[PDB]
Amino acid sequence: ANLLTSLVRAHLDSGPSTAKLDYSKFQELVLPHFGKEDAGDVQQFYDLLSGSLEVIRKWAEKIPGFAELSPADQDLLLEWAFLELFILRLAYRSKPGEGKLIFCSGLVLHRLQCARGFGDWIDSILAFSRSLHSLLVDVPAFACLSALVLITDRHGLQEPRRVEELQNRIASCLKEHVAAVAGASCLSRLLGKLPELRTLCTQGLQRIFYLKLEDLVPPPPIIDKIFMDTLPF
Amino acid sequence: PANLLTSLVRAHLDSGPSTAKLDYSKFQELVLPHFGKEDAGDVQQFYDLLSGSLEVIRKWAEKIPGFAELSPADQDLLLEWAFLELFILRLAYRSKPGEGKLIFCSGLVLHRLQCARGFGDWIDSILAFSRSLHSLLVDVPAFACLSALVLITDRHGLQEPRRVEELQNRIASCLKEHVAAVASCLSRLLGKLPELRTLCTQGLQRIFYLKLEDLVPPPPIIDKIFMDTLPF
């Protein structure tokens, strides 16, 4: 399974091992003033989004065939999938049974430590984490499903058939994996969680809208561009 | 020289429904049933209720002495930037939060449950503000001044900001004197204005969400106020 192996490898290299989990800012209990934020909460919010986008862009460059799509198409796919991938990956790696968010750099933060920057959104992502975890999606299936989040039709693709071919290829790889484990239907079960995920993408845009309104610190330009480019209207 | 106070009271009273003219024909305490998500009729109603205050507030403003002596561009700017705030403040003062009753400027009366789907959490925030405002027991003349102060205020991009400031001055003086005639109370009334700006923000959040959802688009005038008033 050579595409599968490459996908797994790209996934594992885009995230921290248990070895490299960074507890240096983690606090088991903080006492926040809920419903408000300060500049450092907002900057950290954006820094975490920024750091994830860089990691995702490197992950994507490892999905065989992706780096040969047009540069515009690469950028388009990445922007339209970014928040969904940030959420899905964060949920898959976090430990909601401990209130722990684990970000792609290895940084661990307690839910209470994310409350001011993220608002309600982080408590919602942790709920989806529990929902996702109860499906018991294995790493290779996740490696495929995450790639399929990114490699998908989008309005404005220059070469939509080449994206569709790559989507076909990954979906076949996934099908062959789930057969091999079995020795198509949990799929239905997993797709049942998609509305929760979509709602979460929306909530992310809602949070960024609010923070832009408030403007304690501006979003970094690359995030701001994703926000603006993905607003239908 | 109030006179100004009387003119402000008059503009306020002429801009809202007579108790005689309240319409309860659509009012229902009970709704069948709520869970879950907003549908197209909830969203159309949201925008219809907002759009109902447009003309009314514009005509009110034109009766504030001195407002029609600001530049036409400054008039339009003031009205756009204050619109949500005035809608909220006027709705909060007119309504009966103890009963969950919203009274709109057309006279239409709706229960909070009939609004909640379209408005979201914002309607509860508005009703919390309404209960707070009611506890202040703001009299009509004080309210006539307060509302005017919401409109006649510094905004970015005014052509004649000092003339805005003079008229605001005049109105604030009028209010201060009125309150003396009938400082702790004044600062308390005036402390409602920042709360009102927070509620305007929650309104912009609601419209942003609805525009994202796109079941029914905002009407052009509301869409314009929304886009024009994003300071980014």
From Swiss-Prot, chain A:
**Processing and modification events after translation:** Acetylated by p300/CBP, acetylation increases stability. Deacetylated by HDAC1.
The Swiss-Prot or TrEMBL record describes its family as follows: Belongs to the nuclear hormone receptor family. NR4 subfamily.
Q: Which residues form the NR LBD domain?
A: 1-230
Present the record's domain note. Answer: The NR LBD domain binds the lipid A moiety of lipopolysaccharide (LPS) in the cytosol.
Major localization listed first in the record, in broad terms: nucleus
Q: What name does the UniProt record give this protein?
A: Nuclear receptor subfamily 4immunitygroup A member 1
What is the species of this protein? Homo sapiens
Role this protein plays? Orphan nuclear receptor. Binds the NGFI-B response element (NBRE) 5'-AAAGGTCA-3'. Binds 9-cis-retinoic acid outside of its ligand-binding (NR LBD) domain. Participates in energy homeostasis by sequestrating the kinase STK11 in the nucleus, thereby attenuating cytoplasmic AMPK activation. Regulates the inflammatory response in macrophages by regulating metabolic adaptations during inflammation, including repressing the transcription of genes involved in the citric acid cycle (TCA). Inhibits NF-kappa-B signaling by binding to low-affinity NF-kappa-B binding sites, such as at the IL2 promoter. In the cytosol, upon its detection of both bacterial lipopolysaccharide (LPS) and NBRE-containing mitochondrial DNA released by GSDMD pores during pyroptosis, it promotes non-canonical NLRP3 inflammasome activation by stimulating association of NLRP3 and NEK7.
Q: Which gene encodes it?
A: NR4A1
Upregulating conditions: Induced by cytosporone B (Csn-B); directly stimulates its own expression. Induced by corticotropin-releasing hormone (CRH). Induced by growth-stimulating agents.
Which UniProt keyword terms apply here? Acetylation, Cytoplasm, DNA-binding, Inflammatory response, Metal-binding, Mitochondrion, Nucleus, Phosphoprotein, Receptor, Transcription, Transcription regulation, Zinc, Zinc-finger
Region named AF-2: 219-230
GO cellular component terms attached to this protein's record: chromatin; cytosol; fibrillar center; mitochondrion; nuclear membrane; nuclear speck; nucleoplasm; nucleus
Q: Name one GO biological process term.
A: cell migration involved in sprouting angiogenesis
Could you tell me in which tissues this protein is expressed? Fetal muscle and adult liver, brain and thyroid.
- Localization of this protein: Nucleus; Cytoplasm, Cytosol; Mitochondrion
Q: Which domain of life is it from?
A: Eukaryota
Q: Which GO terms describe its molecular function?
A: DNA binding; DNA-binding transcription activator activity, RNA polymerase II-specific; DNA-binding transcription factor activity, RNA polymerase II-specific; identical protein binding; lipopolysaccharide binding; nuclear glucocorticoid receptor binding; nuclear receptor activity; protein heterodimerization activity
Give the stretch of the parent protein shown, with its full length.
362 to 598 of 598
Which residue ranges are recorded for the region named Binds lipopolysaccharide?
160-183
Q: How does it assemble?
A: Binds the NGFI-B response element (NBRE) as a monomer. Binds the Nur response element (NurRE), consisting of two inverse NBRE-related octanucleotide repeats separated by 6 base-pairs, as a dimer. Interacts (via N-terminus) with NLRP3 (via LRR repeat domain); the interaction is direct, requires binding of NR4A1/Nur77 to NBRE-containing dsDNA and lipopolysaccharide, and leads to non-canonical NLRP3 inflammasome activation. Interacts with GADD45GIP1. Interacts with STK11. Interacts with IFI27.
